[PDB]
Amino acid sequence: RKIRRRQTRLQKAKAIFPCPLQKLRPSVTRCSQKFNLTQRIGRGFTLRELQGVGLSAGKARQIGIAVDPRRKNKSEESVARNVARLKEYLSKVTIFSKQAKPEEIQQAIQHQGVVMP
Amino acid sequence: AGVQCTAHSWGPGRAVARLPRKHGGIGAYANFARGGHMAHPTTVIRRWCRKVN
Amino acid sequence: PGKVFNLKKGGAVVRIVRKKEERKTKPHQEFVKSIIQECTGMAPYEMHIIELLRMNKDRHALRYAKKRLGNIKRAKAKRDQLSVYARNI
Amino acid sequence: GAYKYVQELWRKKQSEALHYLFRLRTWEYRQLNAIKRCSHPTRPEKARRLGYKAKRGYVVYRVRVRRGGRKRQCVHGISYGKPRNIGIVGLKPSRSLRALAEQKVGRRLPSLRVLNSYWVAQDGSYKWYEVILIDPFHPWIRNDPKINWICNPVMKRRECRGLTSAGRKARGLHNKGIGAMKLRPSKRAAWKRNHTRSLRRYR
Amino acid sequence: NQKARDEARAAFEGAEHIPKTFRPRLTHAMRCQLTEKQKRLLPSKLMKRKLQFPKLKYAVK
Amino acid sequence: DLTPFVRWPRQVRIQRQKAVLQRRLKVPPTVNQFMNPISRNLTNEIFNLARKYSPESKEEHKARLLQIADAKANGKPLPEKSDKLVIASGIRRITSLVESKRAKLVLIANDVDPLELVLWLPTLCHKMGVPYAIVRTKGDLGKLVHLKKTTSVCFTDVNPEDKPTFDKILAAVAHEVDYAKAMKTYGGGVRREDE
RNA sequence: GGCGGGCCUGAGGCGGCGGGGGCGACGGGCGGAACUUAAGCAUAUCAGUACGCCCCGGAGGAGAAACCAACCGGGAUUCCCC
């Protein structure tokens, strides 16, 4: 099974050579008093933090930012961890356009592993 | 394996040894019988791997 | 219990999700409930409650409403809503 | 501003006007067959909450289910065996009469795939439910995108399998959240997940 | 018979309601399966969004 | 004769029996208004006024498809389809028009499939003040709009040339139809001896 | 009473198209045991299992909160580790 998934996962990679397989998700405070200090990968950046970066909800998904309208911002500090997260991604992203320019796309470093760990 | 066949014990007083038997009276369902299930069947549920730290 | 004890609970500012633009029945929902009530009329369980109020006062009227509607909060509202019809005839 | 008013008239079914039209209708369905084809959805509004639309390829059929506590069937009404399982006169059906009405109309009409069911009339002796069914073969249904997924073979005879509405309530899916953890995929499936014994080889 | 099959095909050709033997064999499931295009078909309201926010190739270092 | 004792098929018998049960039962007033509609001469004089407006014919719909729609590449405008004051039908539209008050005469039909569909229209008419009439057959009201059957047809702003006739029509309805008197009827159950 | 039209609930025939049955697994819904265990047996237990029944797929079922949580909180389902 490990190999089966590994082969399947690399097939996904070549179906989309430009984009990394796993999208960037936000750091969310782990729940319950015992896990208060650590942060974890979360379902989606909330609509509020996304509008702080300045991107519409649809545009973010296209760029690979997952937007979950279920999560509520709650703490103001939660807005801080996620808005900067989105910022560090929007700078580290290069969006190919003009139909398709072949030589540039061929030299693409796909980010294997979850984005911005 | 071995449990596929059908045998209801002939039982005591018929002079047959007491062992499950087929319609004719042939040995079945016993480790000592020909064609019977090995009493303790081998197992695929074994600790094939012995882990090391 | 169900709360941990940090005398100084609160190290991050909290925004309160609230109201969600708290709305109302609005003009149409109430108007329609008037349109149908005008033609169809009051249900029999309601009629008994109103008739209890002209003579008896509450008590047994709430008791019939708890049995018919199944919860006191719905019943307290029903007894009160029904009373408006009671003080006219 | 139209179907809203009918829904309100359907919020009072004890009122004089809504009893009279109910007497006429329940009397008539008693002098009619158990699975009878109805050209018009008797209640037009309720149909559109369930999904019915008046494009051809949609048929409304009315089932009559008798109302009673289940009586287990055994020779001479005795379940031979341990005392806990003796019982043939007060058992209660585990599938609601709405779901049974949906399975019923499916056995006499297999080609059509039923959607959900709307209650029409009821008496003491017999209840009546009307189930909207959609014919997968009629062209308009396949081409229209919204109802196209029913035509997929996976959704064939959903009624019997338990993909109907009163069926999802029957397995308790209609109850989500804690208090329903043990039925999330299915009760028989859940039993296997917890009871599964797996030996990790490299542990 | 080979000559007979082709001659009938010409007569019942490019026509609706062909005779069954001529119709492509397939498996039972394929004969009754939806056409691929109709499966792709989406409600028009749902379709507008796909064009409005289309896929974009992006990479993160 | 032998005609009276003829055993009709079950469908004929059940449909006949429903009428007998209905005429002998209580008949609450809200349903009683539908049972007794406006007089035939009055129906003729509103029906005659419907014919003068009304939407296009089915052949006219085909004529629009072949020329108005197919050759629009040669042209350009979309609504050269008739734009003349027209009766509308259908409960969703009629109720929005009646609630709007823009409508003048509502012509609801005496027979319905579920009576629930137009039970709450007569009250709506007297709450927004709209004059209303119950007339014979949803089908012979459907003919006015050319659809197979219409629960209700709403007279509209109306052409000014027809406005003097329209005012006479409205007045006659204003005596024959009264919302409150009809709510005090409670129907009837005439027995076999009366027949 | 007669006759002809419209609507509505039905009656036959035609045309096209579906539907039925099979598979020792997996899968979904029911109906449903007892031997056993409790050193006896009734509640328990075996077991929401055997078996009976109906239905589908290449996976099905499940699924985008009338949801957990009580925290410096999470966020559809599905699976796996604990």
C12 in contact with A at a CB cutoff of 8 Å?
Answer: yes
Q: What is the C-alpha to C-alpha distance for residues F100 and F94, in angstroms, rounded to an integer?
A: 10
E26 in contact with D at a CB cutoff of 8 Å?
Answer: no
Token pair for D95: 């599938």
Nearest-5° Cα angle at F11, F10 to F16: 100
A38 CB contact with strand G at below 7 Å:
no
Token pair for E61: 């270092």
Q: What is the C-alpha to C-alpha distance for residues D63 and D69, in angstroms, rounded to an integer?
A: 19
Query: Tokens 């809200």 belong to which residue?
Result: F30
The CA–C1' separation of D48 and G66, in angstroms, is 22
Closest by Cα among D71, D42, D70, D41 to D55? D41
Cβ(C56)–Cβ(D32) under 8 Å?
Answer: no
Token pair for F5: 């004792």
Helix (H) / strand (E) element for B11: namely: none
Cβ(C12)–Cβ(A76) under 8 Å?
Answer: yes
Q: What is the C-alpha to C-alpha distance for residues B1 and B36, in angstroms, rounded to an integer?
A: 8
β-partners of residue E60 are A93
- What DSSP string describes D123-184? -SSEEEEEEEEE-SSSHHHHHSHHHHGGGSGGGSSHHHHT-SHHHHHHTTTTS-STT-GGGS
Helix (H) / strand (E) element for D38: namely: strand D35-38
CB within 8 Å: C35 and F30: no
Token pair for F20: 């007998």
Cβ(B29)–Cβ(B36) under 8 Å?
Answer: yes
- Please report residues of F whose CB lies closer than 8 A to that of D5: 95, 120, 124
* C-alpha B3 chain-centroid distance: 7
Chain G, protein-covered positions (CB within 7 A): 1-2, 5-11, 15-20, 27-35, 42-45, 48-49, 54-82
Cβ(B28)–Cβ(D181) under 8 Å?
Answer: no
SS3 F44: helix
CB within 8 Å: A19 and E59: yes
Burial (Cβ within 10 Å: 0-12, 13-18, ≥19) of residue F121: buried
- Please report residues of D whose CB lies closer than 8 A to that of F25: 20, 23-24
B44 in contact with D at a CB cutoff of 8 Å?
Answer: no
Token pair for F35: 């049972």
SS3 D12: coil
Token pair for D39: 């050209």
Q: Residue D143's CB: how many other CB atoms inside 10 A?
A: 15
Q: How was this structure determined?
A: cryo-EM
Cβ(D170)–Cβ(D164) under 8 Å?
Answer: no
C4 in contact with A at a CB cutoff of 8 Å?
Answer: yes
Closest by Cα among F7, F10, F53 to F165? F53
Q: Residue D115's CB: how many other CB atoms inside 10 A?
A: 21
The CA–C1' separation of B19 and G50, in angstroms, is 25
B51 in contact with D at a CB cutoff of 8 Å?
Answer: yes
Q: What is the C-alpha to C-alpha distance for residues F111 and F36, in angstroms, rounded to an integer?
A: 10
Q: Dihedrals φ, ψ of F109, to 5°?
A: -105, 145
Q: How far off is chain D from F5, nearest CA to CA, in Å?
A: 21
Cβ(D130)–Cβ(D120) under 8 Å?
Answer: yes
- Show Cβ contacts of residue F107 under 8 Å, excluding neighbours closer than 6 positions: F46, F50, F133, F135, F141, F144, F152, F153, F154, F155
CB within 8 Å: A16 and E49: no
Token pair for F117: 């569909």
- Show Cβ contacts of residue A95 under 8 Å, excluding neighbours closer than 6 positions: A63, E56, E57, E58
Q: What is the C-alpha to C-alpha distance for residues D18 and D27, in angstroms, rounded to an integer?
A: 14
Q: Dihedrals φ, ψ of D125, to 5°?
A: -75, -45
C7 CB contact with strand G at below 7 Å:
no
B45 in contact with D at a CB cutoff of 8 Å?
Answer: yes
What DSSP state is assigned to residue D53? -
Q: How far is CA F144 from CA C13, F41, F51, F152, F161, in A?
A: 68, 17, 6, 10, 20
The CA–C1' separation of D174 and G61, in angstroms, is 15
C10 CB contact with strand G at below 7 Å:
yes
Residue C4 one-letter amino acid: V
- What DSSP string describes F90-133? SHHHHHHHHHHT----EEEES--SSGGGGTTHHHHHHHTT--EE
C84 in contact with A at a CB cutoff of 8 Å?
Answer: no
Residue B2 one-letter amino acid: G
Token pair for F72: 């629009």
Token pair for B48: 């094939």
Nearest-5° Cα angle at D157, D153 to D163: 95
Q: Dihedrals φ, ψ of D37, to 5°?
A: -80, 130
The CA–C1' separation of D93 and G30, in angstroms, is 10
Q: What is the C-alpha to C-alpha distance for residues D4 and C72, in angstroms, rounded to an integer?
A: 28
- What DSSP string describes C15-39? -----SS----HHHHHHHHHHHHHH
SS3 F64: helix
Strand B8-9 and strand B20-21: the pairing is antiparallel
E-strand spans in chain E? 58-60
Closest by Cα among B34, F150, E58 to A23? E58
Length of chain E: 61
Interface of chain C against chain F, CB under 8 Å? 31, 34-36, 38-40
Query: Tokens 């059957």 belong to which residue?
Result: F149
The CA–C1' separation of D177 and G66, in angstroms, is 10
Cβ(D131)–Cβ(D102) under 8 Å?
Answer: yes
- Resolution, Å (one decimal): 4.9
Q: How far off is chain D from F182, nearest CA to CA, in Å?
A: 14
Q: What is the C-alpha to C-alpha distance for residues A97 and D87, in angstroms, rounded to an integer?
A: 74
What chain C residue is nearest to F29 in terms of C-alpha separation?
Answer: C39
Strand F132-135 and strand F106-109: the pairing is parallel
Q: Residue D16's CB: how many other CB atoms inside 10 A?
A: 18
β-partners of residue D64 are D128
Q: What is the C-alpha to C-alpha distance for residues F41 and C79, in angstroms, rounded to an integer?
A: 51
Q: Residue F136's CB: how many other CB atoms inside 10 A?
A: 16
Query: Tokens 């300045």 belong to which residue?
Result: A54
Nucleotide nearest to D95 (CA to C1'): G30
Query: Tokens 């507008």 belong to which residue?
Result: E48
CB within 8 Å: C13 and A73: no
Residue F170 one-letter amino acid: L
Instruction: Give the F window 76-105 contacts with D, CB below 8 Å.
Output: 91-92, 94-96, 99
Q: Residue D177's CB: how many other CB atoms inside 10 A?
A: 6
- What DSSP string describes C24-78? --HHHHHHHHHHHHHHH---HHHHHHHHHHHHS-STHHHHHHHHHHS-HHHHHHH
In the 3-class helix/strand/coil scheme, how is chain A assigned residue by residue? CHHHHHHHHHHHHHHCCCCCCCCECCEEECCCHHHCCCEEECCCECHHHHHHHCCCHHHHHHHCECECCCCCCCEHHHHHHHHHHHHHHHHCEEECCCCCCHHHHHCCCCCCCCCCC
Q: Dihedrals φ, ψ of F70, to 5°?
A: -65, -40
Cα-only R_g, chain D:
21
Q: What is the C-alpha to C-alpha distance for residues D121 and D72, in angstroms, rounded to an integer?
A: 27
**Chain C 13-42 residues whose Cβ is under 7 Å from strand G:** 14
Helix (H) / strand (E) element for F134: namely: strand F132-135
